[model samples]
Target: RPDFCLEPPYTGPCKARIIRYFYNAKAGLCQTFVYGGCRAKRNNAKSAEDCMRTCGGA
Candidate 1:
Protein backbone atom coordinates (compact mmCIF):
# COMPACT_ATOMS: atom_id res chain seq x y z
CA ARG A 1 0.00 0.00 0.00
CA PRO A 2 1.13 3.51 -0.67
CA ASP A 3 1.37 6.14 2.04
CA PHE A 4 -0.76 8.80 0.46
CA CYS A 5 -0.74 12.28 1.92
CA LEU A 6 -1.44 15.82 0.83
CA GLU A 7 1.71 17.82 0.31
CA PRO A 8 2.54 21.07 2.15
CA PRO A 9 -0.71 20.90 4.19
CA TYR A 10 -2.25 23.98 2.52
CA THR A 11 -0.63 26.36 4.95
CA GLY A 12 -0.56 29.17 2.44
CA PRO A 13 -3.85 30.68 3.59
CA CYS A 14 -6.14 28.17 5.18
CA LYS A 15 -3.90 27.73 8.16
CA ALA A 16 -3.54 31.49 8.42
CA ARG A 17 -7.29 31.82 8.52
CA ILE A 18 -7.50 29.41 11.43
CA ILE A 19 -4.82 31.27 13.32
CA ARG A 20 -6.45 34.62 12.65
CA TYR A 21 -9.81 33.35 13.78
CA PHE A 22 -8.34 31.99 16.99
CA TYR A 23 -6.56 35.27 17.71
CA ASN A 24 -9.71 37.23 17.02
CA ALA A 25 -11.70 35.06 19.40
CA LYS A 26 -9.10 35.23 22.15
CA ALA A 27 -8.47 38.98 21.91
CA GLY A 28 -12.06 39.89 21.04
CA LEU A 29 -10.87 42.08 18.18
CA CYS A 30 -9.89 41.75 14.51
CA GLN A 31 -6.57 43.50 14.48
CA THR A 32 -5.24 41.73 11.43
CA PHE A 33 -6.67 40.17 8.26
CA VAL A 34 -4.43 37.25 7.62
CA TYR A 35 -6.63 35.66 4.99
CA GLY A 36 -8.13 38.69 3.36
CA GLY A 37 -7.54 37.32 -0.14
CA CYS A 38 -8.08 33.67 0.68
CA ARG A 39 -11.71 33.74 -0.35
CA ALA A 40 -10.87 35.10 -3.81
CA LYS A 41 -8.74 32.09 -4.57
CA ARG A 42 -11.27 29.82 -2.91
CA ASN A 43 -14.02 31.16 -5.11
CA ASN A 44 -11.88 30.67 -8.20
CA ALA A 45 -11.58 26.99 -7.32
CA LYS A 46 -13.20 24.63 -9.82
CA SER A 47 -15.90 23.65 -7.38
CA ALA A 48 -16.78 23.41 -3.75
CA GLU A 49 -16.05 19.69 -3.91
CA ASP A 50 -12.61 20.40 -5.32
CA CYS A 51 -11.95 22.96 -2.62
CA MET A 52 -13.00 20.49 0.05
CA ARG A 53 -10.55 17.97 -1.32
CA THR A 54 -7.66 20.18 -0.24
CA CYS A 55 -8.77 20.12 3.43
CA GLY A 56 -10.83 17.04 4.03
CA GLY A 57 -10.70 14.23 6.61
CA ALA A 58 -8.35 11.50 5.63
Candidate 2:
Protein backbone atom coordinates (compact mmCIF):
# COMPACT_ATOMS: atom_id res chain seq x y z
CA ARG A 1 0.00 0.00 0.00
CA PRO A 2 1.02 3.60 -0.61
CA ASP A 3 1.73 5.07 2.79
CA PHE A 4 1.48 8.74 3.58
CA CYS A 5 2.64 11.17 6.22
CA LEU A 6 0.50 13.02 8.73
CA GLU A 7 -2.58 14.93 7.61
CA PRO A 8 -1.83 18.45 6.59
CA PRO A 9 -2.40 20.88 9.46
CA TYR A 10 -2.67 24.17 7.64
CA THR A 11 -5.89 26.01 6.90
CA GLY A 12 -4.50 28.78 4.81
CA PRO A 13 -6.36 30.37 1.93
CA CYS A 14 -9.62 29.30 0.40
CA LYS A 15 -9.33 27.03 -2.63
CA ALA A 16 -5.86 26.14 -1.37
CA ARG A 17 -6.64 22.62 -0.30
CA ILE A 18 -4.28 19.69 -0.07
CA ILE A 19 -5.39 16.09 0.12
CA ARG A 20 -3.45 13.67 2.29
CA TYR A 21 -3.69 9.88 2.42
CA PHE A 22 -3.06 8.00 5.64
CA TYR A 23 -2.99 4.24 5.86
CA ASN A 24 -4.39 2.04 8.60
CA ALA A 25 -2.78 -1.31 8.04
CA LYS A 26 -4.81 -3.04 10.72
CA ALA A 27 -8.09 -1.88 9.21
CA GLY A 28 -6.80 -1.97 5.68
CA LEU A 29 -7.95 1.46 4.73
CA CYS A 30 -6.62 4.66 3.27
CA GLN A 31 -7.88 7.71 5.03
CA THR A 32 -7.82 11.19 3.61
CA PHE A 33 -7.59 14.59 5.24
CA VAL A 34 -7.45 18.19 4.30
CA TYR A 35 -4.28 20.26 4.72
CA GLY A 36 -5.56 23.48 3.18
CA GLY A 37 -2.50 23.79 0.98
CA CYS A 38 0.32 22.98 3.33
CA ARG A 39 3.48 20.94 3.17
CA ALA A 40 3.03 17.19 2.80
CA LYS A 41 4.64 14.11 1.31
CA ARG A 42 4.42 12.73 -2.20
CA ASN A 43 0.95 11.43 -1.44
CA ASN A 44 -0.41 14.97 -1.55
CA ALA A 45 -3.57 15.04 -3.63
CA LYS A 46 -5.84 17.61 -5.19
CA SER A 47 -8.98 16.15 -3.66
CA ALA A 48 -10.12 13.28 -1.53
CA GLU A 49 -11.97 11.73 -4.45
CA ASP A 50 -8.81 11.97 -6.46
CA CYS A 51 -6.85 10.50 -3.60
CA MET A 52 -9.33 7.69 -3.15
CA ARG A 53 -9.15 6.79 -6.81
CA THR A 54 -5.42 6.44 -6.37
CA CYS A 55 -5.39 4.73 -2.99
CA GLY A 56 -8.80 3.05 -3.48
CA GLY A 57 -10.13 2.88 0.06
CA ALA A 58 -13.56 4.21 -0.67
Candidate 3:
Protein backbone atom coordinates (compact mmCIF):
# COMPACT_ATOMS: atom_id res chain seq x y z
CA ARG A 1 0.00 0.00 0.00
CA PRO A 2 1.47 3.25 1.31
CA ASP A 3 4.87 1.59 2.03
CA PHE A 4 5.00 3.65 5.25
CA CYS A 5 5.80 2.21 8.64
CA LEU A 6 3.00 1.41 11.05
CA GLU A 7 2.65 2.50 14.68
CA PRO A 8 3.54 -0.96 15.95
CA PRO A 9 6.41 -3.04 14.68
CA TYR A 10 5.29 -5.31 11.86
CA THR A 11 7.52 -8.20 10.91
CA GLY A 12 6.07 -10.49 8.30
CA PRO A 13 4.80 -10.81 4.77
CA CYS A 14 2.04 -8.59 3.41
CA LYS A 15 -1.19 -10.27 2.33
CA ALA A 16 -2.82 -7.40 0.52
CA ARG A 17 -3.87 -7.01 -3.07
CA ILE A 18 -2.38 -3.55 -3.02
CA ILE A 19 -3.55 -1.41 -5.89
CA ARG A 20 -1.48 1.74 -5.93
CA TYR A 21 0.45 4.31 -7.86
CA PHE A 22 4.03 3.07 -7.94
CA TYR A 23 7.12 5.13 -8.63
CA ASN A 24 8.12 4.41 -12.19
CA ALA A 25 11.91 4.66 -12.14
CA LYS A 26 11.84 5.03 -15.92
CA ALA A 27 9.59 8.05 -15.44
CA GLY A 28 11.40 9.08 -12.24
CA LEU A 29 8.23 9.34 -10.15
CA CYS A 30 5.13 7.67 -8.80
CA GLN A 31 3.04 7.57 -11.89
CA THR A 32 0.78 4.64 -12.79
CA PHE A 33 -1.45 2.16 -10.99
CA VAL A 34 -0.34 -1.41 -10.30
CA TYR A 35 -1.73 -4.69 -9.03
CA GLY A 36 -0.34 -6.35 -5.92
CA GLY A 37 -1.67 -9.52 -4.36
CA CYS A 38 -4.54 -11.95 -4.73
CA ARG A 39 -7.35 -9.41 -4.34
CA ALA A 40 -8.07 -6.98 -7.19
CA LYS A 41 -6.59 -3.94 -8.93
CA ARG A 42 -5.00 -2.68 -12.14
CA ASN A 43 -3.84 -6.05 -13.45
CA ASN A 44 -3.89 -9.69 -12.35
CA ALA A 45 -0.44 -11.06 -11.72
CA LYS A 46 -0.04 -14.46 -10.11
CA SER A 47 3.51 -14.02 -8.81
CA ALA A 48 5.94 -11.20 -8.07
CA GLU A 49 8.12 -11.97 -11.08
CA ASP A 50 5.02 -11.70 -13.24
CA CYS A 51 4.29 -8.27 -11.89
CA MET A 52 7.86 -7.27 -12.64
CA ARG A 53 6.97 -7.16 -16.31
CA THR A 54 3.87 -5.31 -15.18
CA CYS A 55 4.32 -3.15 -12.10
CA GLY A 56 7.30 -1.07 -10.94
CA GLY A 57 9.74 -3.92 -10.40
CA ALA A 58 11.97 -2.74 -13.18
Candidate 4:
Protein backbone atom coordinates (compact mmCIF):
# COMPACT_ATOMS: atom_id res chain seq x y z
CA ARG A 1 0.00 0.00 0.00
CA PRO A 2 1.04 3.56 -0.58
CA ASP A 3 2.03 5.80 2.33
CA PHE A 4 -0.86 8.15 1.73
CA CYS A 5 -3.32 5.27 1.70
CA LEU A 6 -2.19 4.26 5.15
CA GLU A 7 -2.51 7.79 6.50
CA PRO A 8 -5.59 8.91 8.38
CA PRO A 9 -7.94 11.36 6.75
CA TYR A 10 -6.82 14.98 7.09
CA THR A 11 -9.22 17.88 7.03
CA GLY A 12 -7.05 20.93 6.81
CA PRO A 13 -7.42 23.85 9.24
CA CYS A 14 -7.91 26.50 6.57
CA LYS A 15 -11.43 27.67 5.77
CA ALA A 16 -12.20 26.22 2.36
CA ARG A 17 -14.22 23.22 3.42
CA ILE A 18 -14.71 21.68 0.04
CA ILE A 19 -15.66 18.09 -0.63
CA ARG A 20 -12.75 15.74 -1.22
CA TYR A 21 -11.74 12.11 -1.00
CA PHE A 22 -9.34 10.14 1.13
CA TYR A 23 -8.39 6.52 1.31
CA ASN A 24 -9.32 4.72 4.50
CA ALA A 25 -6.74 1.97 4.60
CA LYS A 26 -8.38 0.45 7.59
CA ALA A 27 -11.75 0.27 5.89
CA GLY A 28 -10.23 -0.38 2.47
CA LEU A 29 -12.28 2.29 0.82
CA CYS A 30 -12.10 5.78 -0.60
CA GLN A 31 -14.38 8.00 1.43
CA THR A 32 -15.74 11.50 1.11
CA PHE A 33 -14.41 14.17 3.41
CA VAL A 34 -14.14 17.91 3.94
CA TYR A 35 -10.94 19.55 2.81
CA GLY A 36 -9.91 22.91 4.17
CA GLY A 37 -8.34 25.21 1.60
CA CYS A 38 -4.69 25.16 2.55
CA ARG A 39 -2.33 22.86 4.41
CA ALA A 40 -3.55 19.65 2.89
CA LYS A 41 -1.58 16.43 2.81
CA ARG A 42 -1.15 13.53 0.38
CA ASN A 43 -4.32 12.06 1.81
CA ASN A 44 -6.35 14.66 -0.03
CA ALA A 45 -7.95 13.76 -3.38
CA LYS A 46 -9.88 15.90 -5.81
CA SER A 47 -12.46 13.20 -6.41
CA ALA A 48 -13.42 9.70 -5.35
CA GLU A 49 -12.36 8.36 -8.73
CA ASP A 50 -8.91 9.80 -8.31
CA CYS A 51 -8.66 8.51 -4.77
CA MET A 52 -9.53 5.00 -5.89
CA ARG A 53 -7.17 5.15 -8.80
CA THR A 54 -4.29 5.88 -6.45
CA CYS A 55 -5.25 3.93 -3.33
CA GLY A 56 -8.04 1.53 -4.09
CA GLY A 57 -6.08 -1.72 -4.34
CA ALA A 58 -2.67 -1.38 -2.88
> For each candidate, what is the lDDT?
0.29, 0.51, 0.38, 0.84
Q: Model 1: per-residue lDDT, tens digit, 1-58?
A: 1122222122254444432211122332222234433533221233334333433313
Sequence-dependent TM-score of model 3: 0.26
Per-residue lDDT over 1-58 for candidate 3, one digit per residue giving the tens place of the 0 to 100 score? 2232111222224465444443333443343343434334333334444544454444
Q: How well does candidate 1 score on lDDT at residue 24?
A: 24
TM-score of each: 0.22, 0.34, 0.26, 0.86
Q: Candidate 4 on 1-58: residue-level lDDT in tens?
A: 6787888878767888688889988888888888888888998889888898899954
Residue 57 error, candidate 1, Å: 4.1
Which predicted model would earn the best TM-score?
Answer: 4
Q: Name model 1 segments beyond 4 Å from true.
A: 1-44
TM-score, predicted candidate 2 vs. hidden true structure = 0.34
For model 2, what is the alpha-carbon lDDT of residue 28?
48
Candidate 4 lDDT score relative to the true structure: 0.84
The C-alpha RMSD of each candidate to the native structure, in angstroms, is 11.3, 5.2, 10.6, 1.3
lDDT value, residue 50 of candidate 1: 39
Predicted candidate 4: what Cα RMSD to the true structure?
A: 1.3
| Highest lDDT against the true fold, candidate | 4
Give, for candidate 3, the lowest lDDT window spanning 10 residues.
Answer: 3-12
Candidate 3 residues lying further than 4 Å off, grouped into runs, are 1-19, 36-58
